[PDB]
Amino acid sequence: HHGMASMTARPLSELVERGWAAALEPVADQVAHMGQFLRAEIAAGRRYLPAGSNVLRAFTFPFDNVRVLIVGQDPYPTPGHAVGLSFSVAPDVRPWPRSLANIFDEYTADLGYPLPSNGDLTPWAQRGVLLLNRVLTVRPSNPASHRGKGWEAVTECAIRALAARAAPLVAILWGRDASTLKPMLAAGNCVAIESPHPSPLSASRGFFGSRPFSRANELLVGMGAEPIDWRLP
User: Fold this and answer.
1) Burial class (CB in 10 A: 0-12, 13-18, 19+), 203
2) DSSP secondary structure, the chain, as one string
3) Structural domain of residue 52, as residue ranges?
4) Can you give the CATH number for the domain in which 85 is found?
5) How far is the C-alpha of 135 from the C-alpha of 158, rounded, in Å?
6) In total, how many domains does the chain have?
7) For the chain, does the N or the C end have fewer beta carbons within 10 angstroms?
8) Which sequence ranges are marked TM in the entry?
9) CA separation (Å) from 58 to 20, 95, 158?
10) What is d(CA 182, CA 163) in angstroms, rounded to the nearest whole number?
């Protein structure tokens, strides 16, 4: 079994991939502290999402290959939806969360691809996209309930570590909150794509028509980097 126990007891090198373990070394104490927090939650008769083994999932793909950042706020509050990658759901989830449906609509309009068969964004993560939530856990059906609990330092470290590399980075920033992250990225070889959030509350205010995927690839090519294969089955 993998989860909060490993977060408290095991070194980062045993939790995340090698590049990420080095990049996140400054928040090694904080990850341990978050394990403690989750241990305290369970003791008090509360649950958290996603599964323990998925909390740090975004950092289980090669740090050296990350070329695009997509930031979310916190995990889906619907139990079974959050899988440790921002916006992603398990391949069996139907229908997908409305935010993801909106992302996929723009995906089809921008790229001309057919609608994906399922809501699993793992291929993006396997191809160099960091699907990072700012807060990595949440109490079921209680959005933002773990905000300010200590995850912010960890995910800030991830962002700043990425920016610290010489390599080009495209940051796709959806919503007002994600926009306030620009200062974290300013020291790097980075370009931001900014739009309203794909949430139904704000998607039709400018997310649709924003074409973030083709734009990200254009910017990467311009910066001399490999584009992302955005194609989903």
Assistant:
1) buried
2) --SHHHHHHS-GGGTS-HHHHHHTGGGHHHHHHHHHHHHHHHHTT---BS-GGGTTGGGSS-GGG--EEEEESS--SSTTT--SSTT---TT-SSPPHHHHHHHHHHHHHH-PPPPSS---HHHHHTTEEEEESS--B-TT-TTTTTTSSHHHHHHHHHHHHHHSSS-EEEEEESHHHHTTHHHHTTSSEEEEEE--SSTTTGGGTTTT--HHHHHHHHHHHTT-PPP-----
3) 1-233
4) 3.40.470.10
5) 12
6) 1
7) N
8) none
9) 10, 23, 10
10) 11
Q: Which technique? A: X-ray
CA nearest neighbour of 215 among 106, 115, 84: 106
Please check whether residue 91 is in contact with residue 119, taking contact to mean a CB–CB distance below 8 angstroms: yes
Catalytic site positions: 74
Amino acid in position 218: E
Q: List residues bridging with 70 in a β-sheet.
A: 131, 172
Residue type, 178: A
State how far Cα 133 lies from the chain centre: 4
> Contact 11/28 with Cβ under 8 angstroms?
yes
For this entry, resolution in Å reads: 2.0
Amino acid at 119: G
Separation between Cα atoms, residue 199 and residue 232, nearest integer Å: 20
User: Under 8 Å CB-to-CB from 201, ≥6 apart: which residues?
Assistant: none
The residue length of the chain stands at 233
- The residue type at 189: N
Which amino acid, 228?
A: I
At what angle are helices 212-222 and 98-111 packed, to 10 degrees?
60
